[PDB]
Write a protein that binds this ligand. Structure first.
Ligand SMILES: CCCCCCCCCCCCCC(=O)SCCNC(=O)CCNC(=O)[C@H](O)C(C)(C)COP(=O)(O)OP(=O)(O)OC[C@H]1O[C@@H](n2cnc3c(N)ncnc32)[C@H](O)[C@@H]1OP(=O)(O)O
Ligand SMILES: CN1CCC(CCCCc2ccc(S(=O)(=O)Nc3c(N4CCCC4)ccc4ncccc34)cc2)CC1
Length: 411
């Protein structure tokens, strides 16, 4: 039983999803005027709050809530510690809607107790290529293609209820109130990811990580150990030797991205992302926002040959609190973001990402097996983690697809 999810416009079982052939809406069509004007009722001790993401103190409140109460892994070894600067970046992209950031505070003392964030995204989410094929053989092309145009929808992230308030059914109210504010803007679909299984993903992929600072990494789980390394003499030396990387990028032509690279980066990224079934469409302002280097937050490099950008990669920083281990309390992780390769194999481009991250002091590089991320796992010594990222739509029927048909990176 899902007392909440059974009431929502999502496919209810894997079986139902396995039946889906064309992209399209689940719900009755509705209009903005059908949607309540007033926020969803909540207990009189609580209030709704729309944080001002331009206010340092509002970003700090969100930061603290997530630092202490956001996502942990299954064994509670790590909890994400998104930084304030990271939050301001992720929550405030071009044309963001301040009303879509939704918080619940205790009225008496203004303690933040819960948060959910929506940002706008323009997403391709029409019927996948493999079904557009079944549709032709069968004579139904126009129907299969009806929703091919990129849609301006909502991307949901940072859902978080304070640990003191867990299992009190607060998450459904947050989700209902966000849905109301997005629908009041004449938006009827959302996309979201989670590490938990809910009804019902259209895709799921494993996490993969690449050790950059193995001495620290093995210590968090906790020398001896790894099992396979004990079996010889200088095991720490063998671990360091296995994961060592060059001090400097190998690709001549590599350099940090600059504002004048925006058009070229936009073009080579959009030609690449277009090949996938689900993927975002970015304007120049969105490329500038999500890809231009920002200290501590997002790191982007291009390969430039004869003043032409031919390849690029990006990664962003999310440190995690290390939970029990006393010595090291933060793990500095670099996450593979968007990239495009036209002049060199993908593994050669991403080796430079690992070199740069390592040189900048990151301990590990992490990613999900979306995009073409599988194509460099073995050669660059990534290993599968224990997590799986599931992709979801709200109010959108969508066939099941492989994660290598997904091009949307969620922060
Ligand atoms: C058109 C616009 C639409 C916009 C909205 C689109 C939908 C957006 C949907 C949100 C996408 C978020 C994307 C991310 O940010 S995924 C990251 C989510 N955050 C965390 O994991 C942080 C740590 N955990 C918590 O803060 C809480 O445990 C949360 C908040 C997750 C649950 O709070 P709590 O543990 O106190 O439980 P409750 O008693 O209040 O509520 C229980 C109900 O909640 C359902 N539940 C549990 N986990 C999730 C989850 N990750 N997504 C959606 N639903 C979830 C659960 O199945 C149950 O429903 P049902 O089984 O009874 O039916
Ligand atoms: C948009 N948005 C929504 C929330 C979604 C939930 C997170 C998915 C769960 C989820 C994410 C990732 C993993 S993991 O297998 O990579 N383990 C973790 C690692 N590594 C493990 C060993 C090397 C470093 C390092 C740091 C971590 N920090 C926190 C949690 C796990 C972490 C395991 C589980 C993530 C993305």
């Amino acid at each position: 039983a899902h007392a909440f999810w059974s009431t929502q416009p999502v496919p209810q079982t894997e079986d139902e999803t396995e039946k889906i052939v064309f992209a399209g809406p689940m719900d009755e069509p509705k209009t903005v005027a059908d949607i309540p004007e007033e926020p969803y009722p909540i207990a009189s001790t609580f209030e709704w709050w729309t944080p001002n993401m331009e206010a340092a103190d509002d970003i700090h409140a969100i930061y603290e809530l997530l630092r202490d109460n956001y996502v942990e892994d299954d064994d509670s070894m790590f909890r994400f510690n998104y930084s304030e600067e990271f939050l301001q970046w992720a929550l405030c992209p071009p044309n963001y809607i301040p009303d879509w950031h939704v918080a619940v505070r205790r009225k008496a003392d203004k303690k933040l107790l819960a948060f959910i964030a929506g940002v706008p995204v323009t997403l391709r989410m029409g019927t996948p290529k493999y079904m557009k094929v079944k549709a032709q053989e069968k004579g139904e092309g126009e129907e299969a293609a009806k929703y091919d145009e990129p849609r301006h929808i909502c991307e949901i992230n940072f859902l978080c209820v304070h640990k003191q308030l867990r299992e009190k059914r607060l998450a459904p109210i947050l989700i209902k109130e966000a849905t109301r504010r997005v629908n009041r803007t004449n938006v009827w679909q959302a996309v979201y990811t989670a590490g938990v299984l809910l009804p019902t993903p259209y895709a799921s992929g494993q996490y993969f990580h690449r050790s950059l600072n193995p001495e620290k990494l093995v210590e968090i789980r906790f020398s001896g150990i790894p099992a396979q390394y004990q079996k010889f003499q200088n095991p720490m030396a063998m671990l360091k030797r296995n994961y060592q990387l060059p001090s400097a990028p190998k690709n001549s032509g590599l350099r940090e991205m600059k504002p004048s690279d925006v058009p070229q980066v936009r073009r080579i990224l959009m030609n690449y992302l277009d090949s996938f079934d689900v993927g975002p469409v970015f304007s120049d302002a969105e490329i500038s926002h999500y890809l231009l280097p920002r200290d501590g937050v997002v790191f982007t490099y291009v390969v430039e040959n004869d003043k032409k950008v031919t390849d690029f990669f990006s990664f962003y920083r999310i440190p995690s609190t290390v939970i029990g281990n006393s010595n090291y309390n933060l793990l500095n992780a670099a996450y593979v973001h968007y990239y495009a390769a036209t002049s060199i194999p993908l593994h050669q481009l991403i080796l430079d990402l690992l070199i740069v991250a390592h040189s900048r002091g990151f301990d590990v590089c992490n990613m999900v097996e979306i995009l073409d991320n599988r194509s460099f796992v073995e050669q660059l010594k990534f290993g599968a983690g224990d997590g799986h990222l599931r992709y979801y739509f709200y109010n959108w029927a969508y066939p099941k697809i492989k994660p290598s048909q997904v091009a949307l990176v969620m922060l």
